[PDB]
Amino acid sequence: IPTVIEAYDIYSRLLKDRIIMLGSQIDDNVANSIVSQLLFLQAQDSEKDIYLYINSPGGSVTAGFAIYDTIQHIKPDVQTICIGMAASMGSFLLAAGAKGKRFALPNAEVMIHQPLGGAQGQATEIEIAANHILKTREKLNRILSERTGQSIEKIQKDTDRDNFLTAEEAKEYGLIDEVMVPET
Amino acid sequence: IPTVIYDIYSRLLKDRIIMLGSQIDDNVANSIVSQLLFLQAQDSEKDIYLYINSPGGSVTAGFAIYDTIQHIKPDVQTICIGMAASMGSFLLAAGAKGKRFALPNAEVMIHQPLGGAQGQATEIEIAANHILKTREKLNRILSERTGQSIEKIQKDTDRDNFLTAEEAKEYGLIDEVMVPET
Amino acid sequence: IPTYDIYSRLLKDRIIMLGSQIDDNVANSIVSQLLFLQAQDSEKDIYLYINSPGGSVTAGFAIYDTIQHIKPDVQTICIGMAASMGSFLLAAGAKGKRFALPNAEVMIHQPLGGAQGQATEIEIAANHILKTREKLNRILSERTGQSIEKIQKDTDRDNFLTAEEAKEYGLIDEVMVPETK
Amino acid sequence: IPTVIYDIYSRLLKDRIIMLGSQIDDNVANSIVSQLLFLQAQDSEKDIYLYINSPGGSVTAGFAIYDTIQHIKPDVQTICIGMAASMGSFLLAAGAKGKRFALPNAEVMIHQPLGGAQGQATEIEIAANHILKTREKLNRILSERTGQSIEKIQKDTDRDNFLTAEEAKEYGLIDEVMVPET
Amino acid sequence: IPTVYDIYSRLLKDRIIMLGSQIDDNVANSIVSQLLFLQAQDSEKDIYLYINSPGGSVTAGFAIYDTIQHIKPDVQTICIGMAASMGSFLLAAGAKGKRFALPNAEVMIHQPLGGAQGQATEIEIAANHILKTREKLNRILSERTGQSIEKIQKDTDRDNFLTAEEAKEYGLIDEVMVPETK
Amino acid sequence: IPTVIAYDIYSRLLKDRIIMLGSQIDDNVANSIVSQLLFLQAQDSEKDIYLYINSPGGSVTAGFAIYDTIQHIKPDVQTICIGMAASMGSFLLAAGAKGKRFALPNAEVMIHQPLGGAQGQATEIEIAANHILKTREKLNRILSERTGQSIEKIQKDTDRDNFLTAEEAKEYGLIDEVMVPET
Amino acid sequence: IPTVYDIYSRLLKDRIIMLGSQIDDNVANSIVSQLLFLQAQDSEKDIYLYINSPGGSVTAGFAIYDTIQHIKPDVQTICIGMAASMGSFLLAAGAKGKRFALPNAEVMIHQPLGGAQGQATEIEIAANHILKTREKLNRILSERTGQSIEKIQKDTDRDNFLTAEEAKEYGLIDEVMVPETK
Amino acid sequence: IPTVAYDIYSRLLKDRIIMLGSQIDDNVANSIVSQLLFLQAQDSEKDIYLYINSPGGSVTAGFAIYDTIQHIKPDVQTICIGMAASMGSFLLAAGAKGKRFALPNAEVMIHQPLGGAQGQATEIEIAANHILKTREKLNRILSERTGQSIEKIQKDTDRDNFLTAEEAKEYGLIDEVMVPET
Amino acid sequence: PTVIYDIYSRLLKDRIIMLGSQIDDNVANSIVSQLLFLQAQDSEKDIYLYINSPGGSVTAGFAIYDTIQHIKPDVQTICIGMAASMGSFLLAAGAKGKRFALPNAEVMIHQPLGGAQGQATEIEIAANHILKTREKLNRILSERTGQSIEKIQKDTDRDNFLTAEEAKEYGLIDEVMVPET
């Protein structure tokens, strides 16, 4: 991870331009860092746009929602830019960017899918874990429906299995607003 | 495992005795079912004696044994030694009415089943519905076998429930405490 | 396993016990027992007890084809659980002679597989799995009287059936209810 | 593995049946070669029946079996059940002409051989030349047994090639799909 | 490892980015961040991307590919050692006329790899994704080299090793970098 | 491993003076084969023994236990290569009674110099090295005597792994005939 | 690794690069970056590359080799301890007349190693690549030493250990640096 | 490792002290050679002090340090604390003549080198000849540095030979046992 | 923790060295370097070596021991917690009159341990080395404590646990440090 002297690491230097880089799985540690960067940038300037680059296979649903809620909470618009792949919770966070300011680069991939879970132990414990997983899937689908303009029924059907979208397909689906095509 | 001129279990099988002294898996269930079918083929009318010292195991393996007991013509006596827990207590209760026994210091434990579910939300709901339906099936049969309500079985099996031989008799899991004749 | 061993003694009465996963070893043993029983008497029924979570599809087809090849009717009796390839073999018993005990479970599901390596290798592996699922669904359709379309839908996810539901579905002919003493 | 009064395989060997239901290694080849020599010594005239359900294994173990089949006087019928893949399909095609069979749902898979080569450039060259010469030998024999050109065998074995019983017959790997006895 | 700034941060000051590893999401994140930083420092001056890589993640490679095409500065690519798999794809992604290899540097092109485990329906989806990804890789390589998609497909079936001079003849690079004048 | 009525399949073939080597050669395998040869000699000191060889080789000393026992006993020991006779396997194939060494047509033969290992003090490594070189000279001298090739040619041809067809093994002098199938 | 800068960073100030490890892509990426940095500081002044290495990756070796030949400054090579395998290749890569070994340093030359796993067709491609790479290594070593390719091939079949004096007589180095005061 | 900013070792390096308190591998040799070159560059006339507490390690790593000591102009004093064994004792004996010391309770151990050889007979011969030639080289230099005959060095190093500080002075491995300050 | 130095570096400024670990070549290399550094800073002022150690390498111990005796400055030793095995040896090595233990500190003396593997001739050499090293340890402990070599040999056959006051009575330390004020 290289140093820049004006001593910043490369990410800290980009943070100075209100750029946040998500290039990993989403766990509580990654969520904690991204939330902290969003709170920091809001404290520096409550009006100016933030840029969230997303190259992520996803991870913890609750970690994702910590980032999701922080984005909607803060005053600044958060632009989302997909490079490489936004899968699972990654695609959910891509769709969570400011309306009109969700992008993918032309060869970026987007993948949508129902969440996974686990339940072990007594029949009564499995019933509680199963009810929580079902309610969480309904929450994820209602929000994706609101963010994309697709019906709940279509989101449910389209996320039963792994669903791979091109950047153009993701724009058609309403997960992003535009494909950033080369301009220079 | 000593020899008689047969291994000790094979010798006891000649007296229509089957020994369950392990967890219940598909292998154990396959052995006990085969011994029950063998004994019925030898004599369809003489009693069989099933000794149970088991912490339980596979629910489906237990149902293979349970259905074989009810299917064959011979009465199957159940005799609890040591402990009959979980699926072991289910099978203890499944013996011929009036021929279900525990030795005086044998323990009986009843408890709700366990299960597992890993993968997609849709897979977890399917696994959860299956676990709920299987728990209802176990409780319904335990109710029929003990003369207790499903409501009471459900309440009493939420947590581990340890019974003495006398408590198991009062509950209707067995008919008699088998006290030393001498 | 008391000791003929208990299985060897039941084989004398034309009973085969399947109480494990189906791999090439288990298929080799069951095929050998079917061929032996046909050689002993080509007219008398064989009884195949099935308590199995399934296993290798091709190992399952080695048993399936030997059952349909031999002259004797092979009765199938589900105890405990017939899942995956176990339910397929339960459905493969002689017509009118497919049974489950009252508390036995039947589970149907699409096959599983694996593909590793170059795109071209993954394509070949995927086409083989797809074609094998079509073969399984065609035979299940023929054996149950259900349409291929209904079999495809009902095997997408784990599908658990009671003995009665398995009879209604056409995987078995009768639930074997205990005889009055 | 049940007993008859013989293990089930030994009982079938009495009827000149050899069961291949595993991967092919030196141990399995040693056993099958020994059964072939034993059956020839019992009767040099009567057919032998080789059931094949195998993913294959060692090429040289396969050739030990292949050369024993061609060496002995009795015809060896080959019967594919489940799957005859890799060296298994090679052995299926090696059965007596007119007496190579597959059951209707049995699968056949043909593929170029695999190998390994580690160490010095000069060692890798010797190993790579050996693998290429072994593939030419396999293709020459498959060509002779199927009636396909060496060019077609080379093309059709570059990738895994899965055949139905009917496709295996049309290819010349087997003579007949065995229909049920009634 | 050494300090002057660590050696890499000192080269970054002169708009040089060193790729000397496998490409994963972490490496892609670092190289994308360097590209964005160099653009922010000067949107008009060339960037130099040295490539010694066996490749790695296709999607991680595409993060770098798209960032190169997106930014205003020309990105020169310079192959030292080996550019294989996704490394060769990124070498070919350099600004037209500014893609280089050193004389003894190697280039390897090959179709992508993948895995899929689970239900038939999951494997079909995984298979279709890998096939579509390969068409995408082939389309871009065709555009970057001037070779037909049909030729790219044929030439990447197996591992294809090229000398620097072969890589230039193919259109993967523009020039073999000759030694500076002493 | 099936039964014949009661013998296991290998015990039944042993009754017909057939010994099956279908494994790596270690001290246990050598002990078995040497015991079978001594048994078969005690049964009949005149009738041929048939030693089938499908072996990747193994221990040089284990191989020499089998070699010396073959040459010690009165009966001729035929050798028949099926699958592969490599390393010490090819050595034992060549050690069969002259005129009675065979390979089936698709059987492979591989000849190669021995391998070894030496760890510890320089003085220990010198002793290990001298033993390995002297053992190679012993192997080379006997292969020369068994094939009719010169020691110089054996030395050169075994530097690297040398794969021979059944026909190439016959031409080399490692076997006498390729047993061809009868129609 | 003491401070003064760490000790290696202080020596880099005097245009000294210390190779004291195996050569992998990380080590090559570091040494190439150091050569580029030193050329940018001064394009005329000599660079000093101390080599104590058992070698490593051939392609990582060629990344360093090509960078040495590419840059304007002469790169002196000084062998201490051992320059083996790719280390000997890099020692021979130094500016003609400025390749040295200390009196007790060892040089070892040997053919490259490789690995090939999988289908016969993959093994053929891997073997052809290894053989072509050995021809490239031999051609350059011939140019560096003034020894024929036929002699290099013969002398590198097995591990070939040279004293400093033998390495000079071979043409791998120009001079043995003998102590001036001791 | 405390700070004084310098780490404790860096602070001692400022006074031309180098601390060897570990096994000798290529990394440790790289560091010690780098410190020796740095100290000569700082002042070519002032003594350097090398403290040795080492069980030894790599022979070639040891020769990298040995040859650097003989190459540089400064006298390198050697001071044994704790133990100088194997290559540590070799380096102790290689100090400036008259300036090789041990502390009174320090131990010196001399022993023949160890090695390994695996693979083909021809490979073992080459590895063996290399180990023998290396032992002759170590014995010759110890003979030159101690004034003992090569014959006596050979005999005295067959087995582990443990020396007191006073015995090491008597042997010629050191010049003086260092006497305490007042 | 940091002071504006890590805590150990801050104490080193006051001529305090902290040993709170096993003694290996790395720890000896660090402690010897600290002693040489403090002698060069001021050859007259006392050094303070805190010892809480189970011991470790005998030769690493002697690296420290010889450096303490070699340098001009007095090295005070202060036992806190436990000075066992080579730790007790180093505690005894402090300047006579400036060897201390805190009141609840423990001292343990014991013969050295070793290992020998391989040929009979190798085992004989290793056994002789261990015996001569025990004689060396006993001679120096005798010189440092005023106890006879024969008493030290007797008292160190087995683990011998000493309180701070028993350690003073033995001659391993000079004083038990009483609380200030």
Ligand SMILES: *C(=O)[C@@H](C(C)C)[C@@H](O)C(=O)N[C@H](C(=O)N[C@H](C(=O)O)[C@@H](C)CC)C(C)C
């Ligand atoms: C994509 O990002 C998914 C996986 C990482 C592939 C992600 O959406 C997901 O399902 N994550 C799972 C998760 O957080 N599940 C929670 C949980 O068990 O806590 C459920 C409550 C969601 C219904 C991980 C794999 C457990």
Ligand SMILES: *C(=O)[C@@H](C(C)C)[C@@H](O)C(=O)N[C@H](C(=O)N[C@H](C(=O)O)[C@@H](C)CC)C(C)C
């Ligand atoms: C007592 O025997 C129970 C455990 C061994 C403690 C036993 O009844 C049980 O719950 N076994 C579990 C089981 O078979 N569960 C099945 C299943 O997962 O298939 C559920 C369907 C039952 C609701 C074992 C531990 C999985």
Ligand SMILES: *C(=O)[C@@H](C(C)C)[C@@H](O)C(=O)N[C@H](C(=O)N[C@H](C(=O)O)[C@@H](C)CC)C(C)C
């Ligand atoms: C039920 O028995 C299934 C699993 C054991 C749960 C069984 O039907 C199944 O799919 N088995 C898989 C199998 O044999 N797959 C083969 C294969 O990969 O070769 C496919 C060709 C089947 C379409 C096992 C789990 C791999």
Ligand SMILES: *C(=O)[C@@H](C(C)C)[C@@H](O)C(=O)N[C@H](C(=O)N[C@H](C(=O)O)[C@@H](C)CC)C(C)C
């Ligand atoms: C099918 O049976 C193949 C594999 C088991 C899938 C089989 O034909 C095969 O290639 N086996 C390989 C083999 O025996 N290879 C030899 C060898 O390397 O010794 C080569 C010489 C073949 C040309 C096994 C998997 C190594």
Ligand SMILES: *C(=O)[C@@H](C(C)C)[C@@H](O)C(=O)N[C@H](C(=O)N[C@H](C(=O)O)[C@@H](C)CC)C(C)C
């Ligand atoms: C060269 O760089 C290839 C390998 C690293 C050697 C690379 O191009 C490749 O195929 N990588 C594979 C990849 O990323 N595959 C993805 C995937 O399965 O997730 C496919 C979608 C691409 C068709 C990985 C590293 C398996």
Ligand SMILES: *C(=O)[C@@H](C(C)C)[C@@H](O)C(=O)N[C@H](C(=O)N[C@H](C(=O)O)[C@@H](C)CC)C(C)C
């Ligand atoms: C072929 O059979 C060889 C190997 C199994 C590939 C075999 O000839 C061989 O070299 N075996 C080795 C052996 O026995 N080596 C002894 C030894 O080190 O004791 C040497 C004395 C032989 C010169 C095994 C692999 C060590």
Ligand SMILES: *C(=O)[C@@H](C(C)C)[C@@H](O)C(=O)N[C@H](C(=O)N[C@H](C(=O)O)[C@@H](C)CC)C(C)C
């Ligand atoms: C000496 O440095 C050699 C080894 C480290 C002993 C080195 O020259 C060598 O052969 N390295 C090997 C290598 O890079 N091989 C490549 C490869 O397999 O990718 C060949 C293609 C080069 C002929 C390492 C050991 C793999």
Ligand SMILES: *C(=O)[C@@H](C(C)C)[C@@H](O)C(=O)N[C@H](C(=O)N[C@H](C(=O)O)[C@@H](C)CC)C(C)C
């Ligand atoms: C003492 O320091 C010796 C060992 C550490 C005990 C040391 O001198 C030694 O022998 N080291 C060995 C070594 O470097 N051996 C080389 C080698 O195999 O490369 C020999 C060629 C030297 C004769 C290590 C332990 C391998």
Ligand SMILES: *C(=O)[C@@H](C(C)C)[C@@H](O)C(=O)N[C@H](C(=O)N[C@H](C(=O)O)[C@@H](C)CC)C(C)C
């Ligand atoms: C107390 O510190 C002792 C043990 C750590 C408990 C310590 O004095 C000791 O005996 N250490 C041993 C040691 O250094 N032994 C050397 C050796 O084997 O090299 C002997 C020569 C000492 C006579 C360690 C535990 C090996």
